[PDB]
Amino acid sequence: VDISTLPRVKVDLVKPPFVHAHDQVAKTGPRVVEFTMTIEEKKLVIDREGTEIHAMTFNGSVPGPLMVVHENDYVELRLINPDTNTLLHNIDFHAATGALGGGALTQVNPGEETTLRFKATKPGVFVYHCAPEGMVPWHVTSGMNGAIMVLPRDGLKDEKGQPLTYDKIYYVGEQDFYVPKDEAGNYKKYETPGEAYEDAVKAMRTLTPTHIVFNGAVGALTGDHALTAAVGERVLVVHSQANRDTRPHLIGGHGDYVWATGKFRNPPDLDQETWLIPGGTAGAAFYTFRQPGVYAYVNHNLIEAFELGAAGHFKVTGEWNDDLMTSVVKPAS
Amino acid sequence: VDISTLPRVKVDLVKPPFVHAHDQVAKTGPRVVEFTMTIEEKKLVIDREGTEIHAMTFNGSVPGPLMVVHENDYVELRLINPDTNTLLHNIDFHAATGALGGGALTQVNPGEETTLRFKATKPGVFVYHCAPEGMVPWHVTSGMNGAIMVLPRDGLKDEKGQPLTYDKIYYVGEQDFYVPKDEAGNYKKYETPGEAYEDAVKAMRTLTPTHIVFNGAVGALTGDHALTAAVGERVLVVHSQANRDTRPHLIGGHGDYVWATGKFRNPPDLDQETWLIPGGTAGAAFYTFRQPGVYAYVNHNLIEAFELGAAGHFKVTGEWNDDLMTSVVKPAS
Amino acid sequence: VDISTLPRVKVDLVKPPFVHAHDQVAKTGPRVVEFTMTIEEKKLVIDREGTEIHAMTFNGSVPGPLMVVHENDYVELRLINPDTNTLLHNIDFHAATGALGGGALTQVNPGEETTLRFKATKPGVFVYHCAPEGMVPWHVTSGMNGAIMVLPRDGLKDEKGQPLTYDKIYYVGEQDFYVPKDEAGNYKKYETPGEAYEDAVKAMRTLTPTHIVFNGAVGALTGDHALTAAVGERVLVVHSQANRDTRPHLIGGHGDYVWATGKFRNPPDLDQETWLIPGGTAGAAFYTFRQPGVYAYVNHNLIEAFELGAAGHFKVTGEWNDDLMTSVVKPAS
Ligand SMILES: O=N[O-]
Ligand SMILES: O=N[O-]
Ligand SMILES: O=N[O-]
Ligand SMILES: [Cu+2]
Ligand SMILES: [Cu+2]
Ligand SMILES: [Cu+2]
Ligand SMILES: [Cu+2]
Ligand SMILES: [Cu+2]
Ligand SMILES: [Cu+2]
């Protein structure tokens, strides 16, 4: 088919954990969906101690923004590498077929741009990430990854074929960082990317992250940036991990319907407490809130959550249900 | 509904790997099921070398006892923290909805008790664990975790909707411990919990357990404490890991029906050799023994099993089936 | 039944990643399928640096060869330990029932052989590995593992019960090695297996592989030994990991149908980007190629893939489909 005869729609992306507006059920036929992202190398402070790294980002954030299309739409990405950056970059979409997910066709030096198009033939949530030949894990574990959601044209379905419709969606990107340490255990610091590269490789080869964070920093999804919901609201949480396994858990809730490995032609797993998202995968969990208050959303390696950073919060408004849970006798002597 | 109009039944818990008596198919309507647990901080020897730690337990055991109810029963737990303990504790049930699984409502200092009630709205096996704000992984990885089984009211079902009925059930709790080491690699030792806390945090942050054990110690489920069965018996093995992934395997057998992530509204996976239970999850495997002899039940990271402790035994009585397996020619020159 | 009345067929094994000829749909009734393997202890160079280890192999390769039978065939293995080896060995089949998978019946000193028979009662791909009491992880992580495929008698089926027929099959064995290091980080070297044993145990207990490789060495499945396919071909990739989790991914493709934990009575997961194969398991992924070119097949812990060795290639011939993917604007200033 002549792709030039199809509608074109330009998407304006938003910063995670928020997600650009879209329709769950497709209101048009197939479209070419146009996205632009600008690569930004920048310093980021990632913990409460003030540890600052040289991050590599799509569109200025870790993770990169969530892109949303429907099955059999075409994704057309303009990828810009401005001359204020110093490295070569590209992009691999796990949603795409051919050319190493796009990476073989999108190598951009500083000062260059490119436009890639692919057909989104499989529904699900998928990782995307930079992947320059020979330097792949360094770019990925510097923050250069995000996700894309390819919705079925008739939206999501439960294990019986009945519709599932979310009221809110959030995208939680989980990032393992490998900040090199000296023998005494303090984080080093480097003057150029090339001077950093060998100790970055050394640090990665330990297979022991120094930090594991949501939305780019310890505490990013807390306080004034906590996730929010109301009792009775249906929430989809998309979670990705481009390099390392994770095991999400909503403390005080469940995943009512979970696609742990993210692919919507499969029936969801029901009533999960915790789910495994393998490294290199995006998953999605659907929950209807039943109680108000603070929830923690964590990687349930609790060391990874509470020591290394992989924990955020929901603040949920509404009525308390004492049938579902109550303190019969409050703590007392 | 007026919960006061429902029957109350008091359960008397038993020490793992055994499980209190219960009915698979509910013989009554919904009930308030009353449990009591008393927290005990105690020294435990966890390996053959004599390594002794300061464990934190529910009811004196690692893991804490398996609680069993049916879907839409109410769980009413009296949690006691005697004044012979020194720390603050609480409890989070992954089966429950609201207040961080109960933790926000059950904070008990030494000398205090509390009673929590929640409705068990989802069937499955679930973790429970202590979770005091700011000190969560330390309590969990000191042994303060167990599991609860919420049976469907009409018992278990296979992938076709047909009943599955177990003859025996066992609960295997798997515990990762992080005993601090000095530079030479020997385990340290500490005079108070507060003096231990920083090196416990340091040890946890390595993400490398020093010990990974079933039922609280190397070898606990061997010898006179091996699990037992007969040929032809249907056995359910509930397995939990509150903090770290595991991959159970019955050496010489299978999981005929497995809920790897523990939730009974899902069809089981059939004929598994090995299954992944993510950290923060309980799973359950159903097997019908077909051969007598010794079996090993392991985490099939065989280093974790045979070096670090994650191995137990079954001793199975009955007839040998030479059709299923035989030595045609015994080892010989 | 009198096994002596059944047909016998002798299989002649081939070196991975290739697989001996077989029929997907069984063309005969049940058979005794006869295999022979000869254990070989040998030196292997496993990386580009020239690191040489003392490997322990079935039939001279890491992994051992893929064996293929049908459900309810009998597997009859002659296992030979020649007197040129120095250690005791045996074999455990995860496909088998009883005697620790066969290990209790197959202990062979150098200069001995044995013949084991078992009934392959469950369809799926399964690990086999050596397992000498007390030394199990050392033999496994020295390379002494492979896999066996037990096909359903009517071949593979999709999630709807429709046939799935592969045109090509490959077996990728993934091996974690634990080469002991000195304090400075260089690999040691040892003069006998007994002198190596304690530092091998020490190295294993770090839970941090030094190398993670496909088909026995860094780069083994690249260059003149890349995997091959044509556009439109249906390929099954069997992947095993006897000791540690992995997460396979075809870079530029998908797993159209995946049995991540390898057992064919279960419906496959559709459209996977990445899948988790738990340590101690074999899995299988079915894909129909749609684009030509180079693909990388990796463990999608990208550190494990590109630093530690867990990466191979496909070279795929045929026509490029610009509807599915194209460069709209090639990289340019
Ligand atoms: O369930 N909370 O750690
Ligand atoms: O299957 N045993 O390690
Ligand atoms: O998807 N490639 O790393
Ligand atoms: Cu990059
Ligand atoms: Cu990738
Ligand atoms: Cu506690
Ligand atoms: Cu928890
Ligand atoms: Cu061996
Ligand atoms: Cu095994």
Distance CA B162, CA B160 (A): 6
- HEC per residue, chain A: CCHHHCCEEECCCCCCCCCCCCCCECCCCCCEEEEEEEEEEEEEECCCCCCEEEEEEECCECCCCCEEEECCCEEEEEEEECCCCCCCECCEECCCCCHHHHHHHCCECCCEEEEEEEECCCCEEEEEECCCCCCHHHHHCCCCEEEEEEECCECEECCCCCEECCCEEEEEEEEEECCCECCCCCECCCCCHHHHHHHHHHHHHCCCCCEEEECCCCCCCCHHHCEEEECCCEEEEEEEECCCCECEEEECCCEEEEECCCCCCCCCEEEECECCECCCEEEEEEEECCCCEEEEEEECCHHHHHCCCCEEEEEEECCCCCCCEEEEEEEEC
Q: Give the resolution in Å.
A: 1.1
Catalytic residue among C139, C211, C239, C313: C139
A165 and A45 in one domain? Answer: no
Catalytic residue among B92, B176, B256, B304: B92
**Nearest Cα to A175, choosing from A29, A299, A4?**
A299
- Distance from the CA of A135 to the center of ligand 4, in angstroms? 8
A180 and A123 in one domain? Answer: no
| Cβ proximity of A120 and A70 under 8 Å | yes
Structure-solving method: X-ray
* Domain final position from B152, B168, B193: B152
Phi, psi for A116 (deg, rounded to 5): -110, 140
- Distance from the CA of A108 to the center of ligand 1, in angstroms? 43
User: CB C97 to CB B300 under 8 A?
Assistant: no
Tallying the residues shown for chain C, one arrives at 333
Residue A40 is encoded by which pair of tokens? 């930004």
Beta strands across the sheet bearing B269-272: B211-214, B168-177, B234-241, B281-288, B255-259, B269-272
B158 and B99 in one domain? Answer: no
C312 and C231 in one domain? Answer: yes
Q: Whose CA is nearest to atom 1 of ligand 3?
A: C251
Q: For B160, name the nearest residue in chain C, comparing CA atoms only.
A: C266
A124 and A199 in one domain? Answer: no
Number of Cβ within a 10 Å radius of residue B315: 14
Catalytic residue among A139, A211, A239, A313: A139
- Residue B175 burial (10 A CB sphere; 0-12, 13-18, 19+): buried
Q: How far is C8 from chain B (nearest CA, A)?
A: 14
- Helix, strand, coil shares of chain B as percentages rounded to 5? 10, 45, 45
- B window 178-237, beta carbon within 8 A of C: 208-209
Distance CA C97, CA B289 (A): 9
User: CB B261 to CB A253 under 8 A?
Assistant: no
C211 and C117 in one domain? Answer: no
- C window 99-158, beta carbon within 8 A of B: 99-109, 111-119, 121-124, 126-127, 131, 134, 136-137, 140-141
How many domains, in total, are found in chain C?
Answer: 2
- In a domain, residue B157? The reply is yes
Measured at the CA of C289, the angle between CA C285 and CA C293, to 5 degrees, comes to: 120
* Domain final position from B152, B181, B203: B152
- In a domain, residue C252? The reply is yes
Best of C257, C326, C333 to mutate (most A CBs within 10 Å, chain A): C326
Distance from chain centroid for Cα B29: 27
Residue C121 is encoded by which pair of tokens? 């009662």
According to DSSP, the β-strands at A325-332 and B112-119 are antiparallel
Contacts of A208 (CB under 8 A, 6+ apart): A178, B206, B207, B208, C208
Number of Cβ within a 10 Å radius of residue B310: 29
Residue C309 is encoded by which pair of tokens? 């060795």
- Cβ-nearest to B119 among A295, A296, A324: A324
On whether A129 is known to bind a ligand per the annotation, the reply is yes
Number of Cβ within a 10 Å radius of residue B215: 23
- Cβ-nearest to B325 among C99, C113, C281: C99
3-state secondary structure of C29: coil
B179 and B59 in one domain? Answer: no
C274 C-beta closer than 6 A to ligand 3? no
On whether C22 is known to bind a ligand per the annotation, the reply is no
Distance CA B103, CA B145 (A): 13
Amino acid letter for position C139: H
Q: How far is A62 from chain C (nearest CA, A)?
A: 18
- In a domain, residue C324? The reply is no
List the domain range (segments joined by +) for residue B96: 1-152
C276 and C161 in one domain? Answer: yes
What is the position in ligand 2's atom list of the atom closest to the CA of B252?
Answer: 1
**Nearest Cα to A242, choosing from A213, A206, A278?**
A278
Q: The tokens 């070569």 sit on which residue?
A: A88
- In a domain, residue A186? The reply is yes
Residue B62 per-residue DSSP state: S
- Residue B7 burial (10 A CB sphere; 0-12, 13-18, 19+): exposed
Distance CA A89, CA A38 (A): 11
- Distance from the CA of B242 to the center of ligand 7, in angstroms? 7
Phi, psi for B4 (deg, rounded to 5): -65, -15
Q: Whose CA is nearest to atom 3 of ligand 2?
A: B251
Secondary structure tally for chain C: helices H, strands E: 3, 22
Tallying the residues shown for chain A, one arrives at 333
- C window 244-283, beta carbon within 8 A of B: 244-245, 261-263, 265-266, 276, 278-282
- In a domain, residue C328? The reply is no
| Cβ proximity of B309 and B298 under 8 Å | no
A257 and A203 in one domain? Answer: yes
Residue B59 is encoded by which pair of tokens? 């009811």
Distance CA B167, CA B169 (A): 7
C160 and C301 in one domain? Answer: yes
Secondary structure tally for chain B: helices H, strands E: 3, 22
- In a domain, residue C278? The reply is yes
* Domain final position from C121, C152, C183: C152
Amino acid letter for position B156: L
Which residues in chain A have Cβ-Cβ distances shorter than 8 Å to B107? Answer: 331
Report yes or no: C39 at the B interface, CB cutoff 8 Å.
Answer: no
- In a domain, residue C332? The reply is no
- In a domain, residue A332? The reply is no
A78 and A32 in one domain? Answer: yes
Give me the sign of the Cα torsion angle A13, A18, A19, A21: negative
DSSP conformation letters of C221-268: TSGGG-EEEETT-EEEEEEEESSS-B-EEEET--EEEEETT--TTSPP
A235 and A147 in one domain? Answer: no
